[PDB]
Amino acid sequence: SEGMQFDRGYLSPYFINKPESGSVELENPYILLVDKKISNIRELLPVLEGVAKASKPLVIIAEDVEGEALATLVVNNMRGIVKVASVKAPGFGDRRKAMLQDIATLTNGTVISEEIGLELEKATLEDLGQAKRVVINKDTTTIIDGVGEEGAIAARVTQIRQQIEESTSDYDREKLQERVAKLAGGVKLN
């Protein structure tokens, strides 16, 4: 019940902001969800402009963040220009896409997906998910108290649970149950 946790850690230790625990702890962050690799910093500039309007940190969960995009995020973070962290989206292939949506639903975010005609350079603050806290270390990412609408989160879980009923695979069922447990962990109470 202590957050949605998945087995991807920081993409660079230079995102650490709690050196004594080797971790990134970000309070009331925006959460950018992207179902592709990000390499071109120009794609992120517009969103980063929005984040620059306040003191809210940004967590980027993308298929990967690499090259000039990652380097600029690391340098800006080290300089204190922004408070940012990046992690790889959990999982593989279709399940990775489904789990990015699990996170979007949990956090009231929108997955920036070219599959449906969305473009990273046109992403806005309104597209970003939010949660009370995100904690990242070398191995894991934990999203605590996502702000997603309860009905939407419940409907998502119920849908995953029906998917379990459509399977006769122990492996696949366990993986679906894991998605359920993760969503449940991330809910916001009291």
PDB file of C-alpha atoms in Angstrom:
ATOM      1  CA  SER A   1       0.000   0.000   0.000  1.00  0.00           C
ATOM      2  CA  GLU A   2       3.052   2.349   0.089  1.00  0.00           C
ATOM      3  CA  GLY A   3       3.042   3.645  -3.514  1.00  0.00           C
ATOM      4  CA  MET A   4       3.311   2.257  -6.997  1.00  0.00           C
ATOM      5  CA  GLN A   5       6.798   0.802  -7.222  1.00  0.00           C
ATOM      6  CA  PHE A   6       8.513  -0.441 -10.374  1.00  0.00           C
ATOM      7  CA  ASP A   7      11.953  -1.846 -11.051  1.00  0.00           C
ATOM      8  CA  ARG A   8      13.575   1.012 -12.926  1.00  0.00           C
ATOM      9  CA  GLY A   9      15.944   3.431 -11.163  1.00  0.00           C
ATOM     10  CA  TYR A  10      17.562   6.759 -12.044  1.00  0.00           C
ATOM     11  CA  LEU A  11      19.054   7.133 -15.551  1.00  0.00           C
ATOM     12  CA  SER A  12      21.919   9.102 -13.971  1.00  0.00           C
ATOM     13  CA  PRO A  13      23.155   9.329 -10.366  1.00  0.00           C
ATOM     14  CA  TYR A  14      23.428  13.061 -10.993  1.00  0.00           C
ATOM     15  CA  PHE A  15      19.679  13.238 -10.388  1.00  0.00           C
ATOM     16  CA  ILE A  16      20.281  12.255  -6.733  1.00  0.00           C
ATOM     17  CA  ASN A  17      19.191  14.963  -4.289  1.00  0.00           C
ATOM     18  CA  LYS A  18      19.491  12.940  -1.048  1.00  0.00           C
ATOM     19  CA  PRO A  19      23.128  11.854  -1.097  1.00  0.00           C
ATOM     20  CA  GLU A  20      22.984  10.197   2.348  1.00  0.00           C
ATOM     21  CA  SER A  21      20.430   7.672   0.993  1.00  0.00           C
ATOM     22  CA  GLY A  22      21.568   7.603  -2.635  1.00  0.00           C
ATOM     23  CA  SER A  23      18.135   8.686  -3.754  1.00  0.00           C
ATOM     24  CA  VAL A  24      15.988  11.242  -5.563  1.00  0.00           C
ATOM     25  CA  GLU A  25      13.104  12.509  -3.453  1.00  0.00           C
ATOM     26  CA  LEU A  26      10.783  14.901  -5.261  1.00  0.00           C
ATOM     27  CA  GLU A  27       7.773  16.557  -3.617  1.00  0.00           C
ATOM     28  CA  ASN A  28       4.646  17.248  -5.624  1.00  0.00           C
ATOM     29  CA  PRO A  29       6.333  16.599  -8.977  1.00  0.00           C
ATOM     30  CA  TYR A  30       4.986  16.790 -12.485  1.00  0.00           C
ATOM     31  CA  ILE A  31       5.244  13.504 -14.300  1.00  0.00           C
ATOM     32  CA  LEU A  32       5.923  13.337 -18.041  1.00  0.00           C
ATOM     33  CA  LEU A  33       4.980  10.009 -19.649  1.00  0.00           C
ATOM     34  CA  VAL A  34       6.369   9.226 -23.094  1.00  0.00           C
ATOM     35  CA  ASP A  35       6.088   5.929 -24.975  1.00  0.00           C
ATOM     36  CA  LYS A  36       9.243   6.438 -27.081  1.00  0.00           C
ATOM     37  CA  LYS A  37      12.933   7.188 -26.681  1.00  0.00           C
ATOM     38  CA  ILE A  38      13.800  10.845 -26.141  1.00  0.00           C
ATOM     39  CA  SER A  39      17.167  11.974 -27.617  1.00  0.00           C
ATOM     40  CA  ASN A  40      16.467  15.433 -28.981  1.00  0.00           C
ATOM     41  CA  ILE A  41      16.452  18.161 -26.357  1.00  0.00           C
ATOM     42  CA  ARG A  42      14.356  20.359 -28.648  1.00  0.00           C
ATOM     43  CA  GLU A  43      11.361  18.077 -28.087  1.00  0.00           C
ATOM     44  CA  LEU A  44      11.457  18.796 -24.335  1.00  0.00           C
ATOM     45  CA  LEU A  45      12.095  22.524 -24.432  1.00  0.00           C
ATOM     46  CA  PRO A  46       8.441  23.585 -24.526  1.00  0.00           C
ATOM     47  CA  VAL A  47       7.445  21.412 -21.526  1.00  0.00           C
ATOM     48  CA  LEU A  48      10.559  22.459 -19.638  1.00  0.00           C
ATOM     49  CA  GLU A  49       9.466  26.081 -20.205  1.00  0.00           C
ATOM     50  CA  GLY A  50       6.222  25.275 -18.368  1.00  0.00           C
ATOM     51  CA  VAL A  51       8.039  23.602 -15.506  1.00  0.00           C
ATOM     52  CA  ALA A  52      10.292  26.680 -15.296  1.00  0.00           C
ATOM     53  CA  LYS A  53       7.248  28.814 -14.363  1.00  0.00           C
ATOM     54  CA  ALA A  54       7.167  27.193 -10.854  1.00  0.00           C
ATOM     55  CA  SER A  55       9.237  25.369  -8.208  1.00  0.00           C
ATOM     56  CA  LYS A  56       7.644  22.005  -8.973  1.00  0.00           C
ATOM     57  CA  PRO A  57      10.106  19.230  -9.885  1.00  0.00           C
ATOM     58  CA  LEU A  58       9.733  17.075 -13.007  1.00  0.00           C
ATOM     59  CA  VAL A  59      10.020  13.302 -13.349  1.00  0.00           C
ATOM     60  CA  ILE A  60      10.318  11.984 -16.913  1.00  0.00           C
ATOM     61  CA  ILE A  61       9.321   8.343 -17.469  1.00  0.00           C
ATOM     62  CA  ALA A  62      10.079   7.484 -21.100  1.00  0.00           C
ATOM     63  CA  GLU A  63      11.119   4.361 -23.011  1.00  0.00           C
ATOM     64  CA  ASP A  64      14.580   5.880 -22.642  1.00  0.00           C
ATOM     65  CA  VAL A  65      16.203   9.288 -22.356  1.00  0.00           C
ATOM     66  CA  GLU A  66      19.579   9.505 -24.045  1.00  0.00           C
ATOM     67  CA  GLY A  67      22.158  11.625 -25.862  1.00  0.00           C
ATOM     68  CA  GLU A  68      21.694  15.410 -25.945  1.00  0.00           C
ATOM     69  CA  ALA A  69      18.337  15.180 -24.164  1.00  0.00           C
ATOM     70  CA  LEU A  70      19.744  13.283 -21.192  1.00  0.00           C
ATOM     71  CA  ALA A  71      22.936  15.400 -21.115  1.00  0.00           C
ATOM     72  CA  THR A  72      20.992  18.666 -20.949  1.00  0.00           C
ATOM     73  CA  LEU A  73      18.745  17.340 -18.219  1.00  0.00           C
ATOM     74  CA  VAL A  74      21.787  16.203 -16.190  1.00  0.00           C
ATOM     75  CA  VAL A  75      23.676  19.479 -16.685  1.00  0.00           C
ATOM     76  CA  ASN A  76      20.627  21.648 -15.844  1.00  0.00           C
ATOM     77  CA  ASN A  77      19.876  19.561 -12.802  1.00  0.00           C
ATOM     78  CA  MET A  78      23.460  19.788 -11.542  1.00  0.00           C
ATOM     79  CA  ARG A  79      23.415  23.559 -12.048  1.00  0.00           C
ATOM     80  CA  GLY A  80      20.134  23.892 -10.139  1.00  0.00           C
ATOM     81  CA  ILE A  81      18.261  25.394 -13.143  1.00  0.00           C
ATOM     82  CA  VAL A  82      15.647  22.679 -12.823  1.00  0.00           C
ATOM     83  CA  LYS A  83      14.888  19.874 -10.444  1.00  0.00           C
ATOM     84  CA  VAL A  84      14.464  16.849 -12.658  1.00  0.00           C
ATOM     85  CA  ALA A  85      14.890  13.103 -12.725  1.00  0.00           C
ATOM     86  CA  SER A  86      14.474  10.583 -15.566  1.00  0.00           C
ATOM     87  CA  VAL A  87      13.805   6.829 -15.396  1.00  0.00           C
ATOM     88  CA  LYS A  88      13.071   4.148 -18.025  1.00  0.00           C
ATOM     89  CA  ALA A  89       9.455   3.106 -18.316  1.00  0.00           C
ATOM     90  CA  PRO A  90       9.031  -0.366 -16.715  1.00  0.00           C
ATOM     91  CA  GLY A  91       8.568  -3.508 -18.816  1.00  0.00           C
ATOM     92  CA  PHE A  92       8.856  -4.472 -22.431  1.00  0.00           C
ATOM     93  CA  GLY A  93       6.887  -4.047 -25.667  1.00  0.00           C
ATOM     94  CA  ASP A  94       3.084  -3.998 -25.374  1.00  0.00           C
ATOM     95  CA  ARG A  95       3.192  -4.411 -21.588  1.00  0.00           C
ATOM     96  CA  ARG A  96       5.490  -1.393 -21.295  1.00  0.00           C
ATOM     97  CA  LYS A  97       2.857   0.642 -23.185  1.00  0.00           C
ATOM     98  CA  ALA A  98       0.089  -0.694 -20.932  1.00  0.00           C
ATOM     99  CA  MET A  99       2.068   0.153 -17.783  1.00  0.00           C
ATOM    100  CA  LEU A 100       2.785   3.683 -18.980  1.00  0.00           C
ATOM    101  CA  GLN A 101      -0.975   4.021 -19.182  1.00  0.00           C
ATOM    102  CA  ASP A 102      -1.331   2.531 -15.685  1.00  0.00           C
ATOM    103  CA  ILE A 103       0.871   5.374 -14.502  1.00  0.00           C
ATOM    104  CA  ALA A 104      -1.092   7.958 -16.570  1.00  0.00           C
ATOM    105  CA  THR A 105      -4.376   6.793 -15.058  1.00  0.00           C
ATOM    106  CA  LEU A 106      -2.919   6.779 -11.536  1.00  0.00           C
ATOM    107  CA  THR A 107      -1.563  10.315 -11.899  1.00  0.00           C
ATOM    108  CA  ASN A 108      -4.101  12.087 -14.164  1.00  0.00           C
ATOM    109  CA  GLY A 109      -1.423  12.262 -16.837  1.00  0.00           C
ATOM    110  CA  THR A 110      -1.531  11.761 -20.577  1.00  0.00           C
ATOM    111  CA  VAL A 111       0.883   9.375 -22.305  1.00  0.00           C
ATOM    112  CA  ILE A 112       2.568  11.333 -25.077  1.00  0.00           C
ATOM    113  CA  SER A 113       2.205   8.812 -27.857  1.00  0.00           C
ATOM    114  CA  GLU A 114       2.897   9.327 -31.558  1.00  0.00           C
ATOM    115  CA  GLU A 115       0.812   6.175 -32.205  1.00  0.00           C
ATOM    116  CA  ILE A 116      -2.224   8.427 -31.644  1.00  0.00           C
ATOM    117  CA  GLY A 117      -0.824  11.618 -33.176  1.00  0.00           C
ATOM    118  CA  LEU A 118       0.492  13.315 -30.027  1.00  0.00           C
ATOM    119  CA  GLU A 119       3.869  15.063 -30.237  1.00  0.00           C
ATOM    120  CA  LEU A 120       6.288  15.704 -27.373  1.00  0.00           C
ATOM    121  CA  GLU A 121       6.978  19.272 -28.533  1.00  0.00           C
ATOM    122  CA  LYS A 122       3.244  20.004 -28.178  1.00  0.00           C
ATOM    123  CA  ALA A 123       2.983  18.534 -24.652  1.00  0.00           C
ATOM    124  CA  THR A 124       1.810  20.963 -21.978  1.00  0.00           C
ATOM    125  CA  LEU A 125       1.660  21.065 -18.201  1.00  0.00           C
ATOM    126  CA  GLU A 126      -1.958  19.839 -18.488  1.00  0.00           C
ATOM    127  CA  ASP A 127      -0.570  16.576 -19.977  1.00  0.00           C
ATOM    128  CA  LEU A 128       1.636  15.932 -16.944  1.00  0.00           C
ATOM    129  CA  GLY A 129       0.635  13.573 -14.187  1.00  0.00           C
ATOM    130  CA  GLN A 130       1.023  14.550 -10.565  1.00  0.00           C
ATOM    131  CA  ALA A 131       1.578  12.762  -7.258  1.00  0.00           C
ATOM    132  CA  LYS A 132       2.421  13.703  -3.693  1.00  0.00           C
ATOM    133  CA  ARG A 133       5.947  12.284  -3.963  1.00  0.00           C
ATOM    134  CA  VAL A 134       8.232  10.359  -6.260  1.00  0.00           C
ATOM    135  CA  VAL A 135      11.164   8.480  -4.799  1.00  0.00           C
ATOM    136  CA  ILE A 136      13.850   6.987  -7.086  1.00  0.00           C
ATOM    137  CA  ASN A 137      17.020   5.132  -6.213  1.00  0.00           C
ATOM    138  CA  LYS A 138      19.460   3.075  -8.272  1.00  0.00           C
ATOM    139  CA  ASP A 139      17.008   0.213  -8.740  1.00  0.00           C
ATOM    140  CA  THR A 140      13.407   1.416  -8.286  1.00  0.00           C
ATOM    141  CA  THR A 141      10.884   4.206  -8.755  1.00  0.00           C
ATOM    142  CA  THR A 142       7.983   4.719  -6.287  1.00  0.00           C
ATOM    143  CA  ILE A 143       5.030   6.982  -7.062  1.00  0.00           C
ATOM    144  CA  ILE A 144       3.143   7.957  -3.903  1.00  0.00           C
ATOM    145  CA  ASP A 145      -0.432   9.263  -3.854  1.00  0.00           C
ATOM    146  CA  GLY A 146      -1.188   9.797  -7.567  1.00  0.00           C
ATOM    147  CA  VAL A 147      -3.935  12.366  -8.160  1.00  0.00           C
ATOM    148  CA  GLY A 148      -5.886  10.300 -10.715  1.00  0.00           C
ATOM    149  CA  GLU A 149      -9.674  10.193 -10.538  1.00  0.00           C
ATOM    150  CA  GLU A 150     -10.749   7.265  -8.349  1.00  0.00           C
ATOM    151  CA  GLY A 151     -13.353   5.969 -10.813  1.00  0.00           C
ATOM    152  CA  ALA A 152     -10.760   5.906 -13.603  1.00  0.00           C
ATOM    153  CA  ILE A 153      -8.231   4.041 -11.449  1.00  0.00           C
ATOM    154  CA  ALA A 154     -10.875   1.507 -10.275  1.00  0.00           C
ATOM    155  CA  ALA A 155     -12.088   0.943 -13.858  1.00  0.00           C
ATOM    156  CA  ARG A 156      -8.490   0.332 -14.966  1.00  0.00           C
ATOM    157  CA  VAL A 157      -7.933  -2.233 -12.217  1.00  0.00           C
ATOM    158  CA  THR A 158     -11.207  -3.980 -12.949  1.00  0.00           C
ATOM    159  CA  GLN A 159     -10.273  -4.174 -16.654  1.00  0.00           C
ATOM    160  CA  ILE A 160      -6.871  -5.745 -15.794  1.00  0.00           C
ATOM    161  CA  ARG A 161      -8.637  -8.197 -13.515  1.00  0.00           C
ATOM    162  CA  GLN A 162     -10.877  -9.294 -16.391  1.00  0.00           C
ATOM    163  CA  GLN A 163      -7.758  -9.780 -18.518  1.00  0.00           C
ATOM    164  CA  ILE A 164      -6.604 -12.300 -15.915  1.00  0.00           C
ATOM    165  CA  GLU A 165      -9.830 -14.209 -16.520  1.00  0.00           C
ATOM    166  CA  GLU A 166      -9.053 -14.328 -20.247  1.00  0.00           C
ATOM    167  CA  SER A 167      -5.731 -16.087 -19.651  1.00  0.00           C
ATOM    168  CA  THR A 168      -4.679 -19.641 -18.800  1.00  0.00           C
ATOM    169  CA  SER A 169      -1.005 -18.718 -18.398  1.00  0.00           C
ATOM    170  CA  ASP A 170       0.472 -18.703 -14.906  1.00  0.00           C
ATOM    171  CA  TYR A 171       3.245 -16.369 -16.131  1.00  0.00           C
ATOM    172  CA  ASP A 172       0.863 -13.904 -17.819  1.00  0.00           C
ATOM    173  CA  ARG A 173      -1.612 -13.953 -14.942  1.00  0.00           C
ATOM    174  CA  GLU A 174       1.139 -13.158 -12.399  1.00  0.00           C
ATOM    175  CA  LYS A 175       2.259 -10.235 -14.570  1.00  0.00           C
ATOM    176  CA  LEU A 176      -1.293  -8.869 -14.779  1.00  0.00           C
ATOM    177  CA  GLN A 177      -1.721  -9.290 -11.007  1.00  0.00           C
ATOM    178  CA  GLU A 178       1.482  -7.286 -10.549  1.00  0.00           C
ATOM    179  CA  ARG A 179      -0.044  -4.421 -12.520  1.00  0.00           C
ATOM    180  CA  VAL A 180      -3.094  -4.573 -10.263  1.00  0.00           C
ATOM    181  CA  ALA A 181      -0.937  -4.513  -7.097  1.00  0.00           C
ATOM    182  CA  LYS A 182       1.065  -1.566  -8.415  1.00  0.00           C
ATOM    183  CA  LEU A 183      -2.027   0.517  -9.181  1.00  0.00           C
ATOM    184  CA  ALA A 184      -3.497  -0.280  -5.781  1.00  0.00           C
ATOM    185  CA  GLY A 185      -0.231   0.749  -4.109  1.00  0.00           C
ATOM    186  CA  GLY A 186      -0.375   4.180  -5.702  1.00  0.00           C
ATOM    187  CA  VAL A 187      -3.859   5.212  -4.557  1.00  0.00           C
ATOM    188  CA  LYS A 188      -4.323   8.289  -2.372  1.00  0.00           C
ATOM    189  CA  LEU A 189      -6.184   7.942   0.957  1.00  0.00           C
ATOM    190  CA  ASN A 190      -6.900  10.330   3.919  1.00  0.00           C
TER     191      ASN A 190
END
